[PDB]
Design a binder for these strands. Structure first.
Ligand SMILES: [Sr+2]
Ligand SMILES: [Sr+2]
Length: 95
RNA sequence: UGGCCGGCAUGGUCCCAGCCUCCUCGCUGGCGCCGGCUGGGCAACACCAUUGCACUCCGGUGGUGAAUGGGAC
């Protein structure tokens, strides 16, 4: 079952050999044009590696980012993008 | 040598260059042969496993089973 629109996009299929700090930097480099980004969360743990959460301030940004960068070759791999199942805390602490 | 021991070999002190390494990366570390014991840590690196929905840092295993020469006294 797909997912409903969200402030946060969930990206996976990312190159696992990239360190956390660099991955966050590179992700911002390509995703900041879609709108203000509140934060990017990345973890290299067994369960969370290869994935990232880009948290946009406005849902239109996420939606854009989602449609525009679906399948984008990043670090030699096609980026897969979806909306996050639930709202990230940063967003809850507001709306 | 990450810590520890044994056997054998080996004149010494330096100077220059090169080379080596998971555990004080370098000029007041190290760079003969052989065998056995043991500690730490995944931080870097590699390999294996993982396609995974978080907002709690947190998979496993491996490496030293390493590295040459010149010169001055
Ligand atoms: Sr050493
Ligand atoms: Sr590890």
């Amino acid at each position: 079952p797909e997912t409903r629109p969200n402030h946060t996009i969930y990206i996976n299929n990312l190159n696992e050999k990239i360190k956390k700090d660099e991955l966050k930097k590179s992700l911002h480099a390509i995703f900041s044009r879609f709108g203000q980004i509140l934060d990017i969360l990345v973890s290299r743990s067994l369960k969370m590696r290869g994935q990232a959460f880009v948290i946009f301030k406005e849902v239109s940004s996420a939606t854009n980012a989602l449609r525009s960068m679906q399948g984008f070759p990043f670090y030699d791999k096609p980026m897969r993008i979806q909306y996050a199942k639930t709202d990230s805390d940063i967003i809850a602490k507001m709306k």
